Amino acid sequence: DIIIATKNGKVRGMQLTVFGGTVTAFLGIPYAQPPLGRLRFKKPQSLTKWSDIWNATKYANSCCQNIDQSFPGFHGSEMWNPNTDLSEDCLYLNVWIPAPKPKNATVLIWIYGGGFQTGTSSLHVYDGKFLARVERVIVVSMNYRVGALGFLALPGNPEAPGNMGLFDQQLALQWVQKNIAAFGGNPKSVTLFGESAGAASVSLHLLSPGSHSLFTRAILQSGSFNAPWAVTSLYEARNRTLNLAKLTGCSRENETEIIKCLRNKDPQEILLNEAFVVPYGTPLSVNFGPTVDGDFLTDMPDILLELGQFKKTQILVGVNKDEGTAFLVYGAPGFSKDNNSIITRKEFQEGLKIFFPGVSEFGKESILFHYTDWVDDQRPENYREALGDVVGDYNFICPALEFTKKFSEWGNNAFFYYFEHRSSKLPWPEWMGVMHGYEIEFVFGLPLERRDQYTKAEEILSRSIVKRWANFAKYGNPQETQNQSTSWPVFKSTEQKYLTLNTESTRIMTKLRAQQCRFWTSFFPKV
Amino acid sequence: LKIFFPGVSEFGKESILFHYTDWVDDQRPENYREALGDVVGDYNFICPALEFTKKFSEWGNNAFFYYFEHRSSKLPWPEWMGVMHGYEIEFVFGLPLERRDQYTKAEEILSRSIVKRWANFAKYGNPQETQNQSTSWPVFKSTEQKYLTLNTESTRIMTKLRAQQCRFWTSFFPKV
Amino acid sequence: VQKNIAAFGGNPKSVTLFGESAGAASVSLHLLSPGSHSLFTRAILQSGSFNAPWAVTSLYEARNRTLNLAKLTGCSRENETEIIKCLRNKDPQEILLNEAFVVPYGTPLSVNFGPTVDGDFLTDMPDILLELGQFKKTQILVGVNKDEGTAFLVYGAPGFSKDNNSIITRKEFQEGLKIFFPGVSEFGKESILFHYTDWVDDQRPENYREALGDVVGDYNFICPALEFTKKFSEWGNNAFFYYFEHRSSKLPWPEWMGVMHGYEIEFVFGLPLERRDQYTKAEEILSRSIVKRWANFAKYGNPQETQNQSTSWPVFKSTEQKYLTLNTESTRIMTKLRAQQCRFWTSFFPKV
Ligand SMILES: *[C@@H]1O[C@H](CO[C@@H]2O[C@@H](C)[C@@H](O)[C@@H](O)[C@@H]2O)[C@@H](O[C@@H]2O[C@H](CO)[C@@H](O[C@H]3O[C@H](CO)[C@@H](O)[C@H](O[C@H]4O[C@H](CO)[C@@H](O)[C@H](O)[C@@H]4O)[C@@H]3O)[C@H](O)[C@H]2NC(C)=O)[C@H](O)[C@H]1NC(C)=O
Ligand SMILES: *[C@@H]1O[C@H](CO[C@@H]2O[C@@H](C)[C@@H](O)[C@@H](O)[C@@H]2O)[C@@H](O[C@@H]2O[C@H](CO)[C@@H](O)[C@H](O)[C@H]2NC(C)=O)[C@H](O)[C@H]1NC(C)=O
Ligand SMILES: *[C@@H]1O[C@H](CO[C@@H]2O[C@@H](C)[C@@H](O)[C@@H](O)[C@@H]2O)[C@@H](O[C@@H]2O[C@H](CO)[C@@H](O)[C@H](O)[C@H]2NC(C)=O)[C@H](O)[C@H]1NC(C)=O
Ligand SMILES: *[C@@H]1O[C@H](CO[C@@H]2O[C@@H](C)[C@@H](O)[C@@H](O)[C@@H]2O)[C@@H](O[C@@H]2O[C@H](CO)[C@@H](O)[C@H](O)[C@H]2NC(C)=O)[C@H](O)[C@H]1NC(C)=O
Ligand SMILES: *[C@@H]1O[C@H](CO[C@@H]2O[C@@H](C)[C@@H](O)[C@@H](O)[C@@H]2O)[C@@H](O[C@@H]2O[C@H](CO)[C@@H](O)[C@H](O)[C@H]2NC(C)=O)[C@H](O)[C@H]1NC(C)=O
Ligand SMILES: CC(=O)N[C@H]1[C@H]([C@H](O)[C@H](O)CO)O[C@@](O[C@@H]2[C@@H](O)[C@H](O)O[C@H](CO)[C@@H]2O)(C(=O)O)C[C@@H]1O
Ligand SMILES: *[C@@H]1O[C@H](CO[C@@H]2O[C@@H](C)[C@@H](O)[C@@H](O)[C@@H]2O)[C@@H](O)[C@H](O)[C@H]1NC(C)=O
Ligand SMILES: *[C@@H]1O[C@H](CO[C@@H]2O[C@@H](C)[C@@H](O)[C@@H](O)[C@@H]2O)[C@@H](O)[C@H](O)[C@H]1NC(C)=O
Ligand SMILES: *[C@@H]1O[C@H](CO)[C@@H](O)[C@H](O)[C@H]1NC(C)=O
Ligand SMILES: *[C@@H]1O[C@H](CO)[C@@H](O)[C@H](O)[C@H]1NC(C)=O
Ligand SMILES: *[C@@H]1O[C@H](CO)[C@@H](O)[C@H](O)[C@H]1NC(C)=O
Ligand SMILES: *[C@@H]1O[C@H](CO)[C@@H](O)[C@H](O)[C@H]1NC(C)=O
Ligand SMILES: *[C@@H]1O[C@H](CO)[C@@H](O)[C@H](O)[C@H]1NC(C)=O
Ligand SMILES: [Br-]
Ligand SMILES: [Br-]
Ligand SMILES: [Br-]
Ligand SMILES: [Cl-]
Ligand SMILES: [Cl-]
Ligand SMILES: [Cl-]
Ligand SMILES: [Cl-]
Ligand SMILES: [Cl-]
Ligand SMILES: [Cl-]
Ligand SMILES: [Cl-]
Ligand SMILES: [Cl-]
Ligand SMILES: [Cl-]
Ligand SMILES: [Cl-]
Ligand SMILES: [Cl-]
């Protein structure tokens, strides 16, 4: 029986057997007042003392959210859906620590993604026990509020100021600063890591003065705040808060009374209407996301990035080879996960209208022009592949590269990767390639479990990624120093070197997607 | 090894085996097949060509290095033999420009680009394709050792071809 | 020392660690250990460093050896703590008597029980900490003696004796490799033989004798000390490297063993300054100069002798790799000590 005294109370954990060793897990420690009733839509409030022993032996509730129902019964989608009850009472975190208890272990804090509308830290692919066992780091992960309940904004109004889910994250970071030493952790060696909206989050913590003393270093997997989906404009946010009000019968004029009315609706009514606050939007649109609130975010983040107003530290950033393909089977005509989705020119153009809805005809023609000058006129998969690259370059790759360039220009070491291994177990079809989300299981070391159907080469790849991530967290340098590995060079805005991650040959390459990103980053923002 | 290195000591041959058989997976059936081909190709062609180019460029002259990795669609040898010795020649001489002759469209484009780069090298000392938004071919210098890959898909600038293998053949192996 | 040396007239902010062989390896681990960082200023490493092959016991070696010691003393249990409690009731002599046998193949000099990655003093494998710059940023002075390996040869290598000139044959050489590299493959040992036996003259009788000593000294001391110094200087700090090549006039070991492991120490501690004690005048001058350079290093971070028209000691940088030779005749600046040998031990041999 292992009991740790925290600043707010005792917590009891449980022992896990991992690779013939032991890991101690504390699942579901509360870190804030449950944001219920009058606390709905507000910043998270500090948690007051308890005097008994809190049993942290099961994952806690996941935050309320609309789940993915486009592929019922299919593991490729359902692996991302919440696996604990949904509840507004969801502000909990998880701690995995090595056994025996470490003396001053580096701490990895995971922030899940899911478009700021979904996600939970209890997913199988985020299980921190392998990292704790294999690299003797402490892994922490938190639930934070998503969708309108986490990001509804009336800027300036503390009844619904925006960015609440980011403040949830920030309060979990504070909890680690105050408490992880009792667990054997070093609060001066904390690395944030996250994927998709979790990476965008990590990048906003680099920008937020309130987060600067709460962590050391940062890892951004397939996301950054400058991605086009990651920050909601204050005009978008007001229109959407107001549309949600009308849709729920809560239109008022004392702005605070819209909020009080929204506070009496059941979670289900709020969730049901979230999808429709945007005139044109898909199962994946970021209806309620981060905003410039004047608190967490003091200015438009593109300005802060460009002018060097961010935490000066090392970053590790990267993207997967086929980021865009996942999005195509949620609406683009002609696409299906159950066939090879050979689409025509007309379907391609229709697909652009779905992914770029309020873009001019000329804007969409310019995309088509830049992605359809083929090397062979007659390859049937031309348009299929182009649409996926369009979506992936615009939404993930070019923003991640621009973030890394702009961040490194202020003097800090940055390391960039390109993950191009397709999991042997991937349940999605081969045409979707190296999908968004599917590096995570390598980062968390799932292929280290030989019982679990991965190949030997995937075991070696995950082992190497785990070591590089751990070395980055501990030492600020993502090398594998012992096994004659390719050395990972720093990314500099001139040479733009990056490391490819695959089972065969790991290589140093330069200027990823050079011609594509000049289109998205330089020209396209004008249209 | 005994056939390809006949008057080499037992230790010499063991050292080749040591440097080419530390597998990424113990159990891939083609491990030894692929290793023997790489042994023969690195010793006899690739490492000497790279060493020549380094030593020649060290005296001040522009050098350009390529790595040809396209397997001809018409190749009559089996797939396991890959991008064989001799089989870039037909691209250099422009045979795939003859549409009547069973090559793919991508091979026509590749041969056309190689022919232009060779011709530009002969005429101007610089193997660029300047008109069709092509990857620029950097000079090979003994420090950075940049080279151009030639294939139908994506033509890329890479660095330090066969670095670990050639340190074996060029630095150690001549001692045995 | 931090808490008490001021009462003795000492400056706790000017503390230099120095040590030799396992003591130098220790000094180098204090550079790596966060708990030691505020306890000293500067460091001197004489014939050792933690990256030497004998200096850090693997956690797998260490468990096997703790368990073998348990069986050998009748303390095998399964509550791990109860092995220890049982070991705590044995007499010191019983523990000591069984230490030698915890390793299947080992000599009077093997490091049966050494430093380990304990997660406390040592938070990670030290080679990783060195390579990634995780160590105390300060000046170091590092060096080695010309014949580090010879001492080990008379503790087991066949054909060797301190009481004759130990001319050994090829077969004895190969046998000697098996003693010094016991769990190394046949190919590994052949590769050592290949790199150390391409003679300048086929027929010099002492060829194999000299080669075996250089094998042992380069692998165990010189190449690790040079690699430590390169890797440490790459993070910005001044490092100074020496090569001690004076054979003590009083040395009781035979001349063929040369400038042995351990035999710079008496010069460092100034024993030849005692004229009553049978050293030559040149050895008095050499010890006096070494003592001044060591003291200047401790006090000022710079091992010069500034007053007597001495060779200036350059910093060691990973590009030029300059080092200072220490001898009674002529003290010289040289470059890239053991270049070809160390490329073998440091780059190739760890693969075998
Ligand atoms: C938080 O966890 C603790 C401990 O959790 C356990 O610890 C590990 C080591 C394993 O043993 C796992 O089983 C658990 O994870 C919880 O403490 C348990 O509380 C129960 C109460 O339900 C206790 O069990 C029984 O013990 C007493 C011994 O005297 C019995 O007498 C009790 O039965 C009585 O119930 C009647 C109620 O009026 C009473 O009048 C009768 O006379 C009857 O005898 C009791 O059921 C025991 O203290 C713990 N259980 C175990 C297996 O150790 C703690 O409850 C958890 N906190 C929660 C759930 O909020
Ligand atoms: C800002 O919101 C208005 C209103 O949105 C409508 O009402 C909401 C409650 C919700 O159900 C939305 O889906 C509705 O669209 C948007 O105005 C609508 O725009 C569409 C197409 O442009 C049009 O067909 C509707 O008739 C409009 N409805 C009204 C009431 O004007 C408006 O487009 C939003 N602004 C932006 C920039 O998207
Ligand atoms: C691939 O499938 C899409 C999706 O169609 C659905 O899923 C299929 C696997 C099958 O079960 C169909 O019955 C389903 O309707 C096909 O897209 C449809 O294409 C035709 C015309 O092209 C028509 O039925 C619909 O308009 C399309 N439906 C959607 C949702 O786009 C597509 O044609 C298939 N492509 C190939 C190459 O087989
Ligand atoms: C790990 O230890 C085993 C056991 O060591 C033996 O028992 C000890 C108490 C001690 O007396 C040692 O000297 C013994 O050797 C090693 O296994 C032995 O290996 C040798 C040669 O390889 C063999 O002849 C013995 O029969 C083995 N004995 C047993 C009990 O298995 C083993 O080699 C050690 N591991 C390593 C990597 O050295
Ligand atoms: C040098 O001496 C070694 C050691 O032999 C012992 O010490 C000698 C000084 C002398 O007192 C001997 O009687 C001792 O046995 C000699 O090594 C021996 O060599 C012969 C065969 O070569 C044989 O007696 C033993 O196998 C060896 N013993 C050992 C312990 O190695 C060596 O031959 C002498 N070399 C020279 C050049 O004189
Ligand atoms: C509130 C929620 O989402 N989940 C609860 C959980 C469920 O409500 C319950 O399992 C029915 O679905 O109930 C938890 O608490 C239980 C107590 O009500 C009771 O003492 O019986 C159980 C004893 O084992 C248990 O403690 C749970 O099962 O953990 C609490 C959880 O938040
Ligand atoms: C734990 O370690 C602390 C020092 O942390 C160091 O600095 C930060 C920035 C990281 O880079 C980390 O890896 C370093 O070790 C000490 O100040 C503290 O006293 C230590 N505490 C315990 C209990 O060991
Ligand atoms: C002793 O000297 C102290 C200063 O030490 C200085 O700094 C360290 C880092 C060394 O380089 C040392 O040689 C320097 O002199 C003073 O702070 C202290 O007050 C002094 N105390 C007495 C009693 O003189
Ligand atoms: C109405 O608006 C005023 C002014 O902002 C505010 O003080 C008040 O709390 C709001 N609600 C009510 C019920 O008065
Ligand atoms: C390095 O290789 C060893 C086997 O030689 C393996 O056990 C270990 O997991 C590897 N380490 C990393 C970090 O890949
Ligand atoms: C360049 O492209 C044109 C068509 O746009 C083609 O006809 C020509 O052969 C190409 N030239 C080279 C050198 O590849
Ligand atoms: C036996 O093992 C337990 C568990 O580690 C430990 O608490 C105990 O002190 C050990 N010894 C005895 C005598 O119980
Ligand atoms: C320098 O030379 C003088 C004599 O000229 C001698 O007494 C002194 O010991 C020497 N000092 C050093 C540091 O060698
Ligand atoms: Br948006
Ligand atoms: Br070799
Ligand atoms: Br050892
Ligand atoms: Cl690609
Ligand atoms: Cl077309
Ligand atoms: Cl590219
Ligand atoms: Cl452009
Ligand atoms: Cl094999
Ligand atoms: Cl290569
Ligand atoms: Cl080599
Ligand atoms: Cl010498
Ligand atoms: Cl000989
Ligand atoms: Cl030398
Ligand atoms: Cl060599």
Numbering used by the authors:
A (entry chain A): 3 to 529
B (entry chain A): 354 to 529
C (entry chain A): 178 to 529
From the paper:
Based on these observations, enzymes involved in neurotransmitters breakdown (e.g., cholinesterases (ChEs); monoamine oxidases (MAOs)) are among the main biological targets for the development of new therapeutics. To gain insight into the binding mode of TPP+ conjugates to hAChE and hBChE, attempts to solve the crystallographic structures of the complexes formed between compounds 2–5 and recombinant hChEs were conducted. Compounds 2–5 bind similarly to hAChE and compounds 3 and 5 bind similarly to hBChE, although distinct binding modes of compounds to hAChE and hBChE were observed.
Compound 3 appears to bind hBChE in an opposite way than hAChE: the electron density map of compound 3 clearly indicates the location of the TPP+ moiety at the bottom of hBChE active site (bottom right). The wider opening and overall volume of hBChE active site (500 Å3), compared to hAChE (300 Å3), allows the TPP+ moiety to enter the gorge and bind in the vicinity of the catalytic site. A π-stacking interaction between Trp82 and two phenyl groups of the TPP+ moiety may stabilize the molecule inside the active site. This moiety may be freely spanning outside the active site of hBChE. Thus, the data obtained from the resolved crystal complex of compound 3 with hBChE is highly relevant for two main reasons. For instance, eqBChE and hBChE present different volume of the active site and exhibit three specific residue variations in the gorge site (Val305, Asp311 and Leu313 in eqBChE are replaced with Ala277, Gly283 and Pro285 in hBChE, respectively).
